[PDB]
Assembly symmetry: C6
Homo-oligomer: 202 residues x 6
């Protein structure tokens, strides 16, 4: 990453490398993996972003869809930012320079530490996260329409499932409740908070 002592390059730590690889193994593409990726890549150069993605051993169908999303975002960058060099001067980054495939570590450090910065790590991280969200939505196993409260399922457990499914995918909470809790909820009237709905069905 690039961090403060002036703004300097540091080696990606063995601990960050290991944390990312373990979250992916333990959680696959459950939605919470995305804000973990984002937090573990704080300050990341594009090189570091490629290291984290390249160190994942399975999920190669997912990694391949991610390259497609990366190439689409890169081509849209080249559309808005054509390039045309000057000895000892900085070249403008193209899509593939941002994605880390045709830029060196030194070019990346030079863009990221310029005054003002050309923030190639934050740009690439936005493309990667966009790709990762399409994958989370892909691998979401259930429609929110099939999250229905069981006859003897505690309301809380049902709400946990309902919002878990809705996060992976993205009135109806009440409709999908079981008869008994549904009746209690119809009676609360409009404008009930989730806290009030969950207290009523306890």
């Amino acid at each position: 990453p690039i961090v403060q002592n002036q703004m300097v390059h540091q080696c990606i730590s063995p601990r960050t490398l290991n944390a990312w690889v373990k979250v992916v193994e333990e959680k696959a593409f459950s939605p919470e993996v995305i804000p973990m990726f984002s937090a573990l890549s704080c300050g990341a150069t594009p090189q570091d972003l490629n290291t984290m993605l390249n160190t994942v051993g399975g999920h190669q169908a997912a990694m391949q869809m991610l390259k497609e999303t990366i190439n689409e975002e890169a081509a849209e960058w080249d559309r808005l930012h054509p390039v045309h060099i000057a000895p000892g001067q900085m070249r403008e980054p193209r899509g593939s320079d941002i994605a880390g495939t045709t830029s060196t570590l030194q070019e990346q450090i030079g863009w990221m530490t310029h005054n003002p910065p050309i923030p190639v790590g934050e740009i690439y991280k936005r493309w990667i996260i966009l790709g990762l969200n399409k994958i989370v939505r892909m691998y979401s196993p259930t429609s929110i329409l099939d999250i229905r409260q069981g006859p003897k399922e505690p309301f809380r457990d049902y709400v946990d499932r309902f919002y878990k499914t809705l996060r992976a995918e993205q009135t109806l909470l009440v409709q999908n409740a079981n008869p008994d809790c549904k009746t209690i909820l119809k009676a609360l009237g409009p404008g009930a908070t989730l806290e009030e709905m969950m207290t009523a069905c306890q």
Copy 2:
């Protein structure tokens, strides 16, 4: 977080990220999780606060009630602190800027490091903790009225349960004791410390 070398931004550590995620998995919303959250988010920007909350994989009913509490506190902030910008100058934070949804990391660092600081991380952390306490009270399984000493339960074990329940929820200790220890406690008179009550029933 923001910490001292002057006051600088540091990346949230893999170790803090991991600690928070594990305490939540192992303890759910037992009350002791709150002072752990508070301690692990020392110096946190609002961005970091959102990272810790977003990295929790289950308990999405709880996370949703928390957003409601956050939005209520944010709307009360906008009520007391309306906003109306000046080139190169700091804008005043609204509720949603404090909660980290419409403020950038740079705005957050600028508020938090101003002289005097606009402490957006400490403000948001107070809203989050308020939300978390309502959740601890929600998920508290037992009324203190149903904590009663068993016929052969050691007094200490009963007191542990009584104060555990009372912490999750928030004369009667003696009333809820078993006949034998109850008799010993009635005899101590008024003004007995817990230490004396527990010595008597040993």
Copy 3:
């Protein structure tokens, strides 16, 4: 804690938080937990002291006796140190300011880093340790009078039990020995070291 770079505030580390919580879970109130608490809270502000105590999930009977001891020590502080403020000036700490309930982190840092320091963390830590020792003595299961060497128990194992019990609670070692080792010990005469007693009964 407060530590040296001048004397600065640092966030309590995830590793200290975790160490304290694990020693308590694994050892309860065996006496050795006290010097661990003392060592893990080196440099602690009163806020940090409250964090370590608040993060303990069970033993709420013990935590409650501890508050009683804290309030007693605080009331004795107010007896010896009454307070009576001056813009931009430091107020004198009362008992509850020392215990961290009515003082802010900033007041605590200001007392602890003053020339000369008002060492509010070391004062509160002494109250806490006093409370913790009363708890260690409470939860000590056995009188030293019931530590007696078994007919075929190795002398060393018996001495380990004898001093373990005596530490939790706080001529007789010989009296409580088994007939055979007792006879060997009577013969050594007065003025035998523990090393000599233990060599004789090997």
Copy 4:
């Protein structure tokens, strides 16, 4: 490695040493091991590169093929860069100096920290990675021609295998699909993204 405080030598950390040794034990020469090696050897001197390779306990057939690749690359270096010394002056590195066998740590630090740097660690790391890729291709158990979707294998699982095999080794995805998904894929027409192919066969 060599890292920034000026550019200084630091001891390879016990944590890097241990991470490398564990990834090799747990993953052998699955392709993802290569970008892990590259990331764990950030800043590495040739000495450090030899330490990481020498600390691997099995796979000695692989380590021996790696020496062959190293010697070939070293001989090609000597072909393009003959050497011919001046008191207190730097000698030019030969192949075996780059590979760390006839250069000392001090010569290595002197090349790597010169203005401009003679980047002996990055040169040797490129040779090592080249050798490691030939080993990944060697130990790849399956041809992509034998990755065929099973009659009841979910399409995603098949794509994971297909791209896993293709990474170890390096129209046909559709050909190798099962009849039912093959028919759906023929109908999509040309120019389907992987995301669209995978949605269709869900």
Copy 5:
């Protein structure tokens, strides 16, 4: 400990505390525990030395013999170094000040950082190690006279036992060997190295 940034006090780390406690639990008073204690207490003040010893939960017979050795060494210090104070000046340390029982942390830091240092931590560590060696010799289960090679025990395994026992306790290696290896060893003549003895009996 006291370490270099000038010479400053640092908090004993949770990791040192934990390492010491685990080596004692896993190894008791096997001899190798002594050089581990010595290495984990590098820079230790007497306070830190007491923390490491006080955090050990069992072996209280051993801890008590250790106090006896400490008091003997302290009384011998007072015999050679009597004391007789000057405002703002350093007092001379007595035995019990060195052992950490009547000296404060500040006195300890003042002795240890004086020009020239009064090295109270290194003095106390020598007393502790002396005590620890008497304990290692106490708990040594076997005389070297009962280490004899078994009829089918590999010579190496026997030598491992022989030197293990001799380290806990502190011509005969050959005498204690089995008939067959004994005969081979008699034939080597005088002046055989251990390497040659062990090669001969392979």
Copy 6:
């Protein structure tokens, strides 16, 4: 060790201590332990080198052979470097000063940080490694002459054994192959690389 902030003494870390002790327990004197020892003792003073060797609990036959090798190397040092002191001046190191038995930590730091350095840690580490290699060769269980490919053993697995044995101990690879792979290898002609031999017998 001695490391850079100028060149300063640092305490050997609990993590290095623990890593060395675990590699020895898990790997004994498999050859890869040597470059791990060398890497974990980067910057080591002779004191640190003795700490790492003294903290090993078993293998005391091996530790004793190591002392013999150390004493031989030390006597050869005294043969080439006799000594003959000057107030406030540095004495010349003898063999036993280098090995850490008659030199203090301060003498060691003074030799190692002199301009030019008298590198007593690197000298002693070379003696130790020499001793360790004689031990690796001792404990090598098999001659390379008894590494022969089994009738149904994959060629790779056989090559792994062949080079594992050859590393512990230090045309024939082909001779020791099984009939079928032997025939394929005879046909390749002279000048086949290991990669080509291993491809042919796949």
